Amino acid sequence: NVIIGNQKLTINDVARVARNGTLVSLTNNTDILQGIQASCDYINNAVESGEPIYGVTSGFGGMANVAISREQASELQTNLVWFLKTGAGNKLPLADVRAAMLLRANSHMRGASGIRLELIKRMEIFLNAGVTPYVYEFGSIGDLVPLSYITGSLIGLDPSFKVDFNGKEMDAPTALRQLNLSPLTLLPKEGLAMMNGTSVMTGIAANCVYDTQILTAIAMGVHALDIQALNGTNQSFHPFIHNSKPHPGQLWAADQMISLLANSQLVRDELDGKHDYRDHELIQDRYSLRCLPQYLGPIVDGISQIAKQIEIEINSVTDNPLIDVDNQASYHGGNFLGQYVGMGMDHLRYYIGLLAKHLDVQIALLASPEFSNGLPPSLLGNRERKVNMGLKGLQICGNSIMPLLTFYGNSIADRFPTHAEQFNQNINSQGYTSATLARRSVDIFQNYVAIALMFGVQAVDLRTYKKTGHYDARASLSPATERLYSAVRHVVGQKPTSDRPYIWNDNEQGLDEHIARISADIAAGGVIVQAVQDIL
Amino acid sequence: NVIIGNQKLTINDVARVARNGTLVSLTNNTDILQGIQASCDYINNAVESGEPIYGVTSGFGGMANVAISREQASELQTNLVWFLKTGAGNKLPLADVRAAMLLRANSHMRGASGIRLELIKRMEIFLNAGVTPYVYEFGSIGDLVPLSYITGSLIGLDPSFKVDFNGKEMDAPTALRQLNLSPLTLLPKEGLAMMNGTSVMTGIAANCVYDTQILTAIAMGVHALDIQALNGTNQSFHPFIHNSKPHPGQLWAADQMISLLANSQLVRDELDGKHDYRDHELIQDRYSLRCLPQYLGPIVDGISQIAKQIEIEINSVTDNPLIDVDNQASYHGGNFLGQYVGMGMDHLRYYIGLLAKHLDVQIALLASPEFSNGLPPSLLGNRERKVNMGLKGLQICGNSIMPLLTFYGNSIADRFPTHAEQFNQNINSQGYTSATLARRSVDIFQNYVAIALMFGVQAVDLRTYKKTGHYDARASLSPATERLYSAVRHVVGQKPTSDRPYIWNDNEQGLDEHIARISADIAAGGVIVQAVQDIL
Amino acid sequence: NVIIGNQKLTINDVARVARNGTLVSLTNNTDILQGIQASCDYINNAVESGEPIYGVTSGFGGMANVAISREQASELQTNLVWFLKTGAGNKLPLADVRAAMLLRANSHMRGASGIRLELIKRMEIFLNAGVTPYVYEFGSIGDLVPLSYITGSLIGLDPSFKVDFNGKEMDAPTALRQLNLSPLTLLPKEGLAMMNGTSVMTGIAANCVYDTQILTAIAMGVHALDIQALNGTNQSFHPFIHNSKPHPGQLWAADQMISLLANSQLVRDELDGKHDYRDHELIQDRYSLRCLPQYLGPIVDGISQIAKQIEIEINSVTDNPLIDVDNQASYHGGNFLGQYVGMGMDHLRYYIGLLAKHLDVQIALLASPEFSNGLPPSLLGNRERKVNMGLKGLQICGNSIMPLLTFYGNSIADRFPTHAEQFNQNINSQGYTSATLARRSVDIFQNYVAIALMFGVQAVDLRTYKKTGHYDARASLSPATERLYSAVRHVVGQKPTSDRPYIWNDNEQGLDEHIARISADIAAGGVIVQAVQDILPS
C-alpha cells in the first residue's frame, strides 16, 4: 500500500504508516535493487583491499585516527551497536519509531549506503508485523544512539533489546523466533548505515508537522466560532484588504475565514463595506478578530516552509560515507546533521505558542462581559442558579497551558555544546531533543485546542439564545462551523437542544472528561478532525 | 512521628512524609484547636448575619460582584469543587500530592481559615492510610483546580474523583467506605479554605529542592572524582584564596572540596604552594578545575536562598479571606499568590542547567587525550581490542541531556497572562507549571548525574592503572570519594578488582541499565545518596 | 532614479535610497495618479455626507465609540499627531527613517488611502533634499508614534518636531522655509493614512536583511579561508553528497564552497573520492568544516524566506480604513499589523546567533594547536619573541560577542502585551522593537565578523608559511578568497609580504583599530563587501 523506493514519501504517507498501520512494500524495480547490490559489492571489495574508509576501516568520531584491519571490520560494526547502548529517559511513542524505520528503509533504497537488501526488508517486516523496538528519549545530539536500539532489535543482538509486538513487550531474539527470522550479523559499513542518520528525529518531526497542520485547521474553526459568538463582522476578511497586502499565508487565512463564516446568521454580514456606529461598542472589532489573517499569515506560512523541509529530509540519503558506484568512489560527508530538523522544530514550537496565545485572547473576550458583546460572564449557562460560575475554571486551566506553550517556544538548536564527543562534533543540531520537545508542544496544544473548542461551542449557543430564544445554534451557524460544533458535541456526548446549551449547571459535568475526550478525538483523527478536513 | 500544628515544617519533614510514608499527627494542643474552632465559629456567625465576605457571601473571581444569600452559602462551596473540575495532562507523582495535603493541613492548623477540624483530620487520615487523590499537571496559574481534586476526593463528592489506595486505583466514595468514613458536606468558606492556596506548587517545589540539594552534593563528589582522574591539584581550594573572596557559597564549596580531596593519592598535593612547571601540560589546571568554587558559589548560595523561601511558604497561611478572631474580623488578601514558588523554581531550573553544563565540561576533558593528562581516548578500557570506543556513546548521551537542562533553565514567571480569568487575575505567578517544570529538570538531572558518576568512576580506575599497574582505585582515592565510588560500583553490580576497570570491553554491558540503576538509587535515597550525606 | 509607484520595490532599492542617497521620483503614470485622486475624492464625499468611518468620523482605538462629526473631522487628524508625540529612548539611524518614508510614499501610491498627492510629494522632496525627521526607538508595538514625528515634520506642524538637514539639526518649520514649502493642514483621514502603517519597522527590517545577506556572504568567505588555513579537504562539498540531501540552502552552500575553494593550493583536493589516513590524526575534518553546507542550509534558506516576506511587506498597502474606489466602499481591516516583520526579525536574530557560534568554533580550531593541524598557538607570528601570545586577546573578545549574539537570538513576538491600548490591541506584533533588536544584532555581527576575518587572513599566512616557507598567501589561495584576503589587508593597511604575516609581534598594532576599520568597511559597502559580490545575487 505504501511503496518504498519509487516515489518520494510525503508527511501524510509517513503518518499513515506510523499511526494507522498502513502496510509497506519495497519496490521490485530492478534498477533500484541493482543500486542497493552495487554499493554492497563496492564496500565488500574495498574492505577486501584494506582501503581507508571512515567508520569501516577506521574508528568512529574523534577516534577516527584508529585504523581498523580487514579482519576486525565486521566486529567493528557489531561493537558500534554495544557502545551506543546508552539511552535514557522515557520511551519514544511507538508511532515515532515506526516513522523512523520507514525513513531508514527509504534512505537505504537509494543505493548509496552499502547495506544488504535483507537488512532493509527486516524493517519492512517489523513494520508489517507490528514489531516496534524500544527507543529512549535521550542519547542523540542530532541519531546513532536511538538507532542502535532499532538495529540491535532488528538483528536480535541480545535479550537486552526490548520490543513491542502488537502491544506485548518481549525481547528482540524472541520476536525474531516468532517471525521465523534468523539473527543477523552486521557486515562492514552496515552498522554505520543503520545508525548514521536523521531518520528518528525526522520521524518525530514528520508526525509533529502532521498534527500541527490539523490543529491549525481546528484552530481556524475555533476562531470562526469565536467571531460568531462575538457578533463580529466578516468585513475584515474582504479580499480587497488582503490582495493589497498579499502574503500567501494572510491571503490563505482570510480566504479560509470567508469560507468558514459563509452563510452564518450570527456574523455581521458586511462584505458590501457597511460599518455604521454601534453602542456601547466600538465601531471596529478588536485586534484578535480584525487582524486575524495578518497575525496568522506568518504562522501558516512557516508551518508550510517547515513541512517542505521535513519532506526533503524524509527523502534524503542521510548517512556517511556515501557510495557513488558510478564513479566507483566513496565520500566523507555530513548528511547525518539534522539542521533543518533542529531549527524547524524550534520554529514549530514557537508558532504553536503564538497560536495558543491568540486563541487565549479570544477566550478572554468571550468570558468577560466588558468585551463579549452581551454574553453572560464566563459564559455561564443557568443564570437562575446563582452559584454557577460557568467556565471560570475552564478559562484558568487554559491560562495555565498557554504560558507553557510559549515557554516551549524557546529554542534549542542555538544551545549546542561545542565540546561534544571529544571535540569532534563541535557543531551539532540538537535536532532529536528539539523534535521530542516539539512532540511535547503538540501533545499539550491538543488539550489547549480542546478547551478552545469548548469555549467556542458554548459561546455560540449563548449567542443563539440572545438571537432566537433557544440554544440550538446549528441553524444559526455557517454550515462549515456547524460541522465542527456538532462533531465536538458528538464527542462529548451532549446533544444540542433548544432548551439547553452545552453547559447549563456546573455540577452536571466534569469538564476534565470533555477536554480528555476531545483531545483523544483530535489525536485519533476522529470526527473533529474530519469536520475541518476541507481546510487541510 | 511528624506532628502538625506545633513547630514549623522543614523541607526534610515534607520529604519524609511524601516519599517515605512517615506517619503524621495533628497536635493536641488546645490553644491550637481553640484557634481552629474560633474561626469556624466566626464564619458561621457571619453567614448567619448575611455579612459580605469574599467567596462566602459573594461569587468568585471576576464574578465577585454576584452577592450570594445565606441560603446558598453551603451550595456555593460544593459548586466551587465542580466548576474547578477541569484539570488536564498527566498526573502529578503521588509524593507531590502527599506533600500538598501535608501543607494544606499545616496551613489550616493556624486557625485563620475557618475550617472544621474534621476536614483537617481527613487529610491526616488519607496521609496515614496511603490514599492519594489524582491531581493533573494542568489547571493552576499559581492552586484552585488541582486542590479541587484533593477536596472532592476527601469528601467523596462523586465517583468521578479517583484516588490511589496503596497502589490500587479506585473511586473516592469507595475509598471512604473502606476507611469507614462518611462523605462530607462543605460548610461556607470550607471549599475556598480547601482550594485557595499554594500547597500543591509548594509541595512539588519542596521535593524539588530536597532532590536538588542531594544532587548538588553528588555533583560535588563527581567533580572530586574528576579532579583525581585528571591529576589536578588541591591548591585551588586553599583557604587563603577563598577567605580573600568570601562569598558563603564559594567558601563552602572550596572547603568541602578540601574535605573531599583529603588524603588522596591521585591529586597533586600542594597546599604548601608548590607549583613547578609541567610538560607537555600547562602550569595551572583549566577553569573547570581551578574556578570550581567561584563557579559553584552562586549556585550553592541560590539553592539555599530558595530552600529558605520554600520553608517560609510551607509554613504560611495561604488562603483568602484570613479570619482574625482576636479582632473578630476578616480581611481580603493575596496570600494565595505563589510568587516565591514561581520565581524560585525559575531560579532552581536555571542553576541545575548551570551545574550540568560545568559537569559536562569535566567529561569533555576526561574523554579527550588532548586534555585528560594521559588517559585513553573516551576512557576506553581494553586497548588490546581495537574496536572499543569506550565511553564515546555515554558522552554523546550526556551531550544530549545537558543542552536540554539549560533549555529548561529558561523562565516562566515573566510569561504570565494579564488577561487571566476575566481580567481579574491580571498578575499571576505561573508557580504551578514552574514547579512541574522544575520536577522535570530534577528527573532529567538525576539521569545526567548518573552518567557523570560513571565517567568519574571509570576515570579514576584508568588513572590508578597509570599510577600502580592495576585498576583498583579504592586505596588511591581519598576516603571520602572511595565511599561514593564504591556505592556506585555496588549499585551497578560490577565489583572493583585489580585486573579490570569498571568498563573493560564495550560488548560486556548495556550502559543504559547502569544509568537506570544509578538514577533509581539516587531517586530512592539509596547508598549513593548516603555516601555524600556528610556534605548535606 | 528609483521610481515610486510603478514597479515593486526591492530590498536593494530601499537600501540604495536609505544609505546611498539615491534619488527618487513619483511615477507620472496616469492610472496611478487617477487612483490617488479618486480615493481622495471618495473621502471628501463620504465625510461631507456624514458617513461613519473609523478614525475619520470616530474615535481612535479603544475610543472608537466616540462619534465625531465632519465639523471636527480636520481637527481630529491634527490632534492625532499631538497625542502620539510620546517617543522615548535613542533615535533611529537616519537611514531607517529614509527607508520609512520611502515605503510610506510607496504605500500611498497604490491608491487606497485617500491622501493628497501633495503630501506624498512632500516625502519625495525630503528624501531628495536629504531632510530626515528625528524618530525615537520606543513608542510602537507594531508605527503610529514614530510616523507621527515623520508627519509632524513633513507638514511643519510645530518647532518641537526636529529634523536632520544634511548634517545640521533644525526644527521642521525652519526646514520647510528652506525648501520654500508652506506648512500643510491635514484633511480628514490624512493623519491616519500618514501614521497607520508598517513603514518604519519594515524600513528598519529591510536594511537589516540587506546587511545580513552581505554578512552571510562574508561569513562564507571566512569559512573558505579557515578551511584553507586548516588544510581541510574539499570533499565535503562534493555534489553527489548534497544532491542526495537536496535542500536548496545546503545545495547552494555546498556549491558556493566549491567555487570559493576552486584552484586553492592550501586545500586537500580530493573530489575524486580519495581519503588516506592522516598521521596521527583524524581521517575526516571535524563537523565545523564537514557539515558546513548542512548547517548553513536552514540559515541561508531562512534569510531568503524573510527577504521574500519583507519584499512583500515593503510593497503592501498598510493602513486602515482602505478605500475601494471601484465599489465606492471603505473596509475596516488590519493591514497595520506587521506580524511578518516581528516574527521574521525574531528569526533573523536567531540565525545571526547561529552563524556567529559556528564561526567562533572555527576560530577555536585555528587558535588551538591540538586541533589547528600544525598552526602555531593563538596564530602567533614572531615565535622568536617568547613574550608574544598572538591573537589570544582577539579570541577572548570574539568569545565575548558570540554569546551575546545568541542571547539577542531570543524572540520578542511571543511576548506581546494582551492589555495593550485599552484592551483594543489585544494582539500585536512587537515588530518595531523586534527590528530595532535586529539592528543591534546586525551591528554587533559586523564587529564579530571583522574578528573572524582577521583570524582567517592571519591563519592562511601561517599555513602558506607552513607550505612554502613564506607569508604571502596571495598565490596559494584560490582566486576567490584571494580577493577578500587582499581587501582586508588593504582596509587595515598592512600589506601581504613574503617576509611577514599579517600579525608579526603583539606591540606592532592595536588590534582594536583593525576591528574598527574592517567593521566600518563592511558597514560602508567597501572593498571587503565588493570582494564577495559574486556570492550575493545567488
mmCIF file of N, CA and C in Angstrom, chain A residues 52 54 57 64-65 235 241 244-245 247 250 275 277 280-281 284 287-288 290 294 297 301 313 317 320 330 332-333 335-337 339-340 343 346-347 350-351 357 361 414 416 426-427, chain C residues 52 57 65 235 241 244-245 247 275 277 280 282 284 287-288 290 294 297-298 301 309 313 317 320 330 332-335 337 340 343 346-347 350-351 357 361 414 416 424 426-427:
data_model
loop_
_atom_site.group_PDB
_atom_site.id
_atom_site.type_symbol
_atom_site.label_atom_id
_atom_site.label_comp_id
_atom_site.label_asym_id
_atom_site.label_seq_id
_atom_site.Cartn_x
_atom_site.Cartn_y
_atom_site.Cartn_z
ATOM 1 N N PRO A 52 41.339 2.646 3.190
ATOM 2 C CA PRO A 52 40.863 3.532 4.261
ATOM 3 C C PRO A 52 39.488 4.136 3.945
ATOM 4 N N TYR A 54 36.122 5.875 6.293
ATOM 5 C CA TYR A 54 35.625 6.238 7.625
ATOM 6 C C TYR A 54 34.572 5.263 8.109
ATOM 7 N N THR A 57 37.106 1.016 7.964
ATOM 8 C CA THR A 57 38.480 0.600 8.237
ATOM 9 C C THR A 57 39.130 1.639 9.156
ATOM 10 N N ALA A 64 38.741 8.483 14.930
ATOM 11 C CA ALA A 64 38.913 8.123 13.522
ATOM 12 C C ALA A 64 40.383 8.168 13.078
ATOM 13 N N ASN A 65 41.281 8.307 14.061
ATOM 14 C CA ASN A 65 42.702 8.062 13.825
ATOM 15 C C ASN A 65 43.141 6.639 14.153
ATOM 16 N N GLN A 235 -16.267 41.590 7.432
ATOM 17 C CA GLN A 235 -15.594 42.606 6.609
ATOM 18 C C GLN A 235 -14.062 42.499 6.649
ATOM 19 N N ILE A 241 -8.824 43.981 1.081
ATOM 20 C CA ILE A 241 -7.849 44.277 2.148
ATOM 21 C C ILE A 241 -6.580 43.450 1.970
ATOM 22 N N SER A 244 -4.233 43.689 -1.261
ATOM 23 C CA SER A 244 -3.289 44.784 -1.187
ATOM 24 C C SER A 244 -2.148 44.561 -0.167
ATOM 25 N N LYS A 245 -2.184 43.448 0.587
ATOM 26 C CA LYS A 245 -1.052 43.044 1.440
ATOM 27 C C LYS A 245 -0.794 41.547 1.225
ATOM 28 N N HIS A 247 0.795 38.662 1.292
ATOM 29 C CA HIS A 247 1.483 37.487 1.824
ATOM 30 C C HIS A 247 0.580 36.287 1.591
ATOM 31 N N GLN A 250 -1.456 35.104 4.760
ATOM 32 C CA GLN A 250 -2.545 36.068 5.054
ATOM 33 C C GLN A 250 -3.681 35.964 4.022
ATOM 34 N N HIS A 275 -20.495 49.888 7.710
ATOM 35 C CA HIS A 275 -19.986 49.901 9.090
ATOM 36 C C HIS A 275 -20.496 51.118 9.874
ATOM 37 N N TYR A 277 -22.217 53.216 13.210
ATOM 38 C CA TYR A 277 -21.850 53.192 14.627
ATOM 39 C C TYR A 277 -22.580 52.069 15.359
ATOM 40 N N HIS A 280 -23.159 50.058 23.277
ATOM 41 C CA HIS A 280 -21.986 50.854 23.702
ATOM 42 C C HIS A 280 -20.639 50.555 22.967
ATOM 43 N N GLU A 281 -20.682 49.702 21.938
ATOM 44 C CA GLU A 281 -19.482 49.094 21.361
ATOM 45 C C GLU A 281 -18.644 50.005 20.447
ATOM 46 N N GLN A 284 -15.253 49.292 15.352
ATOM 47 C CA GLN A 284 -14.489 48.153 14.811
ATOM 48 C C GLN A 284 -14.358 47.009 15.807
ATOM 49 N N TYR A 287 -8.455 43.635 17.929
ATOM 50 C CA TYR A 287 -7.393 43.117 17.040
ATOM 51 C C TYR A 287 -7.450 41.610 16.829
ATOM 52 N N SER A 288 -7.646 40.854 17.907
ATOM 53 C CA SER A 288 -7.816 39.393 17.796
ATOM 54 C C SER A 288 -8.837 38.963 16.732
ATOM 55 N N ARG A 290 -10.013 41.353 14.106
ATOM 56 C CA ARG A 290 -9.769 42.120 12.902
ATOM 57 C C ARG A 290 -8.447 41.822 12.220
ATOM 58 N N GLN A 294 -3.669 38.795 9.208
ATOM 59 C CA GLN A 294 -2.323 39.338 9.293
ATOM 60 C C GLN A 294 -1.481 38.617 10.369
ATOM 61 N N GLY A 297 -0.885 34.764 9.226
ATOM 62 C CA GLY A 297 -0.179 34.555 7.960
ATOM 63 C C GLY A 297 1.199 33.905 8.112
ATOM 64 N N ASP A 301 2.383 30.357 7.071
ATOM 65 C CA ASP A 301 3.473 30.299 6.126
ATOM 66 C C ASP A 301 4.647 29.495 6.640
ATOM 67 N N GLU A 313 13.985 16.322 3.936
ATOM 68 C CA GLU A 313 14.738 15.487 4.920
ATOM 69 C C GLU A 313 14.302 13.996 4.886
ATOM 70 N N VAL A 317 19.240 10.963 1.538
ATOM 71 C CA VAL A 317 20.215 9.983 1.966
ATOM 72 C C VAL A 317 21.013 10.692 3.041
ATOM 73 N N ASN A 320 26.815 8.398 6.244
ATOM 74 C CA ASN A 320 28.210 8.671 5.905
ATOM 75 C C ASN A 320 29.103 7.429 6.085
ATOM 76 N N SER A 330 33.805 6.493 -2.714
ATOM 77 C CA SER A 330 33.072 6.882 -1.511
ATOM 78 C C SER A 330 33.565 8.253 -1.019
ATOM 79 N N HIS A 332 33.455 11.224 2.342
ATOM 80 C CA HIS A 332 33.136 11.502 3.746
ATOM 81 C C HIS A 332 32.370 12.844 3.772
ATOM 82 N N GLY A 333 31.144 12.828 4.283
ATOM 83 C CA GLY A 333 30.240 13.991 4.212
ATOM 84 C C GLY A 333 29.543 14.184 5.536
ATOM 85 N N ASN A 335 25.801 14.539 5.867
ATOM 86 C CA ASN A 335 24.332 14.452 5.737
ATOM 87 C C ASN A 335 23.606 13.946 6.978
ATOM 88 N N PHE A 336 24.337 13.309 7.879
ATOM 89 C CA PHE A 336 23.793 12.958 9.206
ATOM 90 C C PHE A 336 23.394 14.148 10.089
ATOM 91 N N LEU A 337 23.840 15.365 9.778
ATOM 92 C CA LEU A 337 23.474 16.524 10.610
ATOM 93 C C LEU A 337 22.090 17.069 10.275
ATOM 94 N N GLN A 339 20.151 19.675 10.707
ATOM 95 C CA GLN A 339 19.920 21.104 10.984
ATOM 96 C C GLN A 339 18.522 21.602 10.655
ATOM 97 N N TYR A 340 17.949 21.256 9.488
ATOM 98 C CA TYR A 340 16.527 21.527 9.182
ATOM 99 C C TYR A 340 15.577 21.027 10.256
ATOM 100 N N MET A 343 16.249 23.146 13.699
ATOM 101 C CA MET A 343 15.747 24.518 13.571
ATOM 102 C C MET A 343 14.278 24.598 13.221
ATOM 103 N N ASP A 346 12.345 24.092 16.446
ATOM 104 C CA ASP A 346 12.424 25.321 17.251
ATOM 105 C C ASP A 346 11.365 26.274 16.729
ATOM 106 N N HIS A 347 11.348 26.485 15.399
ATOM 107 C CA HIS A 347 10.288 27.243 14.730
ATOM 108 C C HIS A 347 8.879 26.701 14.999
ATOM 109 N N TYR A 350 7.734 27.552 18.541
ATOM 110 C CA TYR A 350 7.492 28.982 18.624
ATOM 111 C C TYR A 350 6.126 29.395 18.024
ATOM 112 N N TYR A 351 5.764 28.832 16.872
ATOM 113 C CA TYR A 351 4.465 29.123 16.225
ATOM 114 C C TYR A 351 3.267 28.603 17.036
ATOM 115 N N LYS A 357 -1.596 31.524 22.304
ATOM 116 C CA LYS A 357 -1.729 32.840 22.929
ATOM 117 C C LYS A 357 -2.806 33.735 22.287
ATOM 118 N N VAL A 361 -6.623 34.875 23.922
ATOM 119 C CA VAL A 361 -7.124 36.238 23.841
ATOM 120 C C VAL A 361 -8.575 36.225 23.375
ATOM 121 N N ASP A 414 20.396 26.613 19.055
ATOM 122 C CA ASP A 414 21.472 27.542 19.435
ATOM 123 C C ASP A 414 22.195 27.130 20.736
ATOM 124 N N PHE A 416 23.584 24.211 21.391
ATOM 125 C CA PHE A 416 24.511 23.093 21.144
ATOM 126 C C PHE A 416 25.843 23.271 21.867
ATOM 127 N N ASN A 426 31.875 19.458 16.985
ATOM 128 C CA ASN A 426 31.971 20.816 17.510
ATOM 129 C C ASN A 426 30.786 21.690 17.027
ATOM 130 N N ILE A 427 30.133 21.299 15.919
ATOM 131 C CA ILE A 427 28.773 21.755 15.684
ATOM 132 C C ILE A 427 27.809 20.557 15.664
ATOM 133 N N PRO C 52 -20.256 57.230 8.669
ATOM 134 C CA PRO C 52 -19.379 56.769 9.753
ATOM 135 C C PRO C 52 -18.195 55.956 9.206
ATOM 136 N N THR C 57 -14.521 59.655 11.145
ATOM 137 C CA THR C 57 -15.697 60.119 11.907
ATOM 138 C C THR C 57 -15.868 59.357 13.227
ATOM 139 N N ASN C 65 -15.773 54.295 19.901
ATOM 140 C CA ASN C 65 -17.193 54.539 20.063
ATOM 141 C C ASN C 65 -17.485 55.988 20.353
ATOM 142 N N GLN C 235 36.412 17.700 -0.269
ATOM 143 C CA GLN C 235 35.490 16.564 -0.442
ATOM 144 C C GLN C 235 34.111 16.718 0.208
ATOM 145 N N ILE C 241 27.077 14.171 -2.619
ATOM 146 C CA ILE C 241 26.596 14.184 -1.248
ATOM 147 C C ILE C 241 25.340 15.041 -1.134
ATOM 148 N N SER C 244 22.036 14.175 -2.948
ATOM 149 C CA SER C 244 21.230 13.176 -2.245
ATOM 150 C C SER C 244 20.547 13.688 -0.934
ATOM 151 N N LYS C 245 20.886 14.914 -0.508
ATOM 152 C CA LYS C 245 20.137 15.623 0.536
ATOM 153 C C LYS C 245 19.747 17.010 0.014
ATOM 154 N N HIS C 247 18.374 19.937 -0.030
ATOM 155 C CA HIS C 247 17.806 21.173 0.475
ATOM 156 C C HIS C 247 18.398 22.298 -0.357
ATOM 157 N N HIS C 275 40.688 9.466 0.216
ATOM 158 C CA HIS C 275 40.778 9.784 1.656
ATOM 159 C C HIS C 275 41.696 8.839 2.444
ATOM 160 N N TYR C 277 44.610 7.823 5.377
ATOM 161 C CA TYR C 277 44.848 8.096 6.798
ATOM 162 C C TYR C 277 45.791 9.282 6.989
ATOM 163 N N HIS C 280 49.393 11.624 13.294
ATOM 164 C CA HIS C 280 48.397 10.607 13.620
ATOM 165 C C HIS C 280 47.167 11.405 14.019
ATOM 166 N N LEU C 282 42.804 12.611 12.458
ATOM 167 C CA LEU C 282 41.522 12.054 12.039
ATOM 168 C C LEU C 282 41.312 12.025 10.531
ATOM 169 N N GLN C 284 38.753 12.225 8.834
ATOM 170 C CA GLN C 284 37.851 13.308 8.393
ATOM 171 C C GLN C 284 38.091 14.646 9.111
ATOM 172 N N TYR C 287 33.298 18.377 12.332
ATOM 173 C CA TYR C 287 31.975 18.842 11.891
ATOM 174 C C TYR C 287 31.928 20.294 11.444
ATOM 175 N N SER C 288 32.522 21.226 12.199
ATOM 176 C CA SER C 288 32.535 22.652 11.734
ATOM 177 C C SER C 288 32.827 22.837 10.226
ATOM 178 N N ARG C 290 33.111 19.867 7.807
ATOM 179 C CA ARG C 290 32.464 18.815 7.027
ATOM 180 C C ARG C 290 30.950 18.928 6.991
ATOM 181 N N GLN C 294 25.296 21.554 5.345
ATOM 182 C CA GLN C 294 24.126 21.163 6.114
ATOM 183 C C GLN C 294 23.785 22.130 7.242
ATOM 184 N N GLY C 297 22.521 25.530 5.611
ATOM 185 C CA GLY C 297 21.338 25.413 4.708
ATOM 186 C C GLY C 297 20.086 26.128 5.228
ATOM 187 N N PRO C 298 19.576 25.723 6.418
ATOM 188 C CA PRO C 298 18.367 26.370 7.014
ATOM 189 C C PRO C 298 18.532 27.878 7.208
ATOM 190 N N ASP C 301 18.500 29.529 3.760
ATOM 191 C CA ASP C 301 17.109 29.377 3.330
ATOM 192 C C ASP C 301 16.128 30.272 4.092
ATOM 193 N N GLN C 309 9.450 37.834 2.361
ATOM 194 C CA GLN C 309 8.308 38.325 3.144
ATOM 195 C C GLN C 309 8.388 39.839 3.330
ATOM 196 N N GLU C 313 6.021 42.919 2.265
ATOM 197 C CA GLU C 313 5.608 43.952 3.232
ATOM 198 C C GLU C 313 5.966 45.377 2.825
ATOM 199 N N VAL C 317 -0.137 47.690 0.964
ATOM 200 C CA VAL C 317 -0.846 48.877 1.458
ATOM 201 C C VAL C 317 -1.099 48.619 2.946
ATOM 202 N N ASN C 320 -5.559 51.669 7.382
ATOM 203 C CA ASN C 320 -6.913 51.322 7.689
ATOM 204 C C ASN C 320 -7.566 52.668 8.053
ATOM 205 N N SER C 330 -15.280 51.860 1.814
ATOM 206 C CA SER C 330 -14.098 51.648 2.671
ATOM 207 C C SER C 330 -14.268 50.423 3.585
ATOM 208 N N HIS C 332 -12.907 48.359 7.004
ATOM 209 C CA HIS C 332 -12.200 48.353 8.248
ATOM 210 C C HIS C 332 -11.468 47.002 8.311
ATOM 211 N N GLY C 333 -10.146 47.044 8.507
ATOM 212 C CA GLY C 333 -9.298 45.855 8.474
ATOM 213 C C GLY C 333 -8.037 46.016 9.301
ATOM 214 N N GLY C 334 -7.083 45.088 9.146
ATOM 215 C CA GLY C 334 -5.879 45.075 9.980
ATOM 216 C C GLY C 334 -4.484 45.095 9.359
ATOM 217 N N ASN C 335 -4.327 45.627 8.145
ATOM 218 C CA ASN C 335 -3.010 45.603 7.482
ATOM 219 C C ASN C 335 -1.864 46.275 8.234
ATOM 220 N N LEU C 337 -0.895 45.608 11.080
ATOM 221 C CA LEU C 337 -0.203 44.627 11.916
ATOM 222 C C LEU C 337 0.974 44.064 11.163
ATOM 223 N N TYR C 340 4.652 39.664 10.054
ATOM 224 C CA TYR C 340 5.812 39.157 9.318
ATOM 225 C C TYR C 340 7.115 39.772 9.736
ATOM 226 N N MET C 343 7.970 38.469 13.665
ATOM 227 C CA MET C 343 8.446 37.080 13.699
ATOM 228 C C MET C 343 9.656 36.884 12.775
ATOM 229 N N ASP C 346 12.610 38.214 14.647
ATOM 230 C CA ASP C 346 12.899 37.155 15.588
ATOM 231 C C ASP C 346 13.782 36.070 14.971
ATOM 232 N N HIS C 347 13.354 35.568 13.812
ATOM 233 C CA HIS C 347 14.063 34.536 13.083
ATOM 234 C C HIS C 347 15.452 35.052 12.682
ATOM 235 N N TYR C 350 17.893 35.145 15.553
ATOM 236 C CA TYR C 350 18.211 33.745 15.793
ATOM 237 C C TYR C 350 19.261 33.218 14.809
ATOM 238 N N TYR C 351 19.044 33.399 13.498
ATOM 239 C CA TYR C 351 20.008 32.938 12.516
ATOM 240 C C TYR C 351 21.373 33.554 12.649
ATOM 241 N N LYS C 357 28.080 31.517 16.212
ATOM 242 C CA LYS C 357 28.555 30.378 17.002
ATOM 243 C C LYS C 357 29.404 29.394 16.174
ATOM 244 N N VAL C 361 33.536 28.593 16.803
ATOM 245 C CA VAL C 361 34.044 27.205 16.837
ATOM 246 C C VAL C 361 35.219 27.008 15.846
ATOM 247 N N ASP C 414 6.444 36.660 20.627
ATOM 248 C CA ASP C 414 5.669 35.872 21.571
ATOM 249 C C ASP C 414 5.436 36.603 22.928
ATOM 250 N N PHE C 416 4.142 39.679 23.428
ATOM 251 C CA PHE C 416 3.218 40.789 23.309
ATOM 252 C C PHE C 416 2.306 40.989 24.544
ATOM 253 N N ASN C 424 -7.862 47.075 23.382
ATOM 254 C CA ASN C 424 -8.289 47.038 21.990
ATOM 255 C C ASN C 424 -7.270 46.250 21.159
ATOM 256 N N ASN C 426 -5.350 43.743 21.662
ATOM 257 C CA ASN C 426 -5.098 42.502 22.409
ATOM 258 C C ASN C 426 -4.182 41.492 21.682
ATOM 259 N N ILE C 427 -4.114 41.543 20.339
ATOM 260 C CA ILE C 427 -2.912 41.019 19.681
ATOM 261 C C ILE C 427 -2.097 42.192 19.111
#
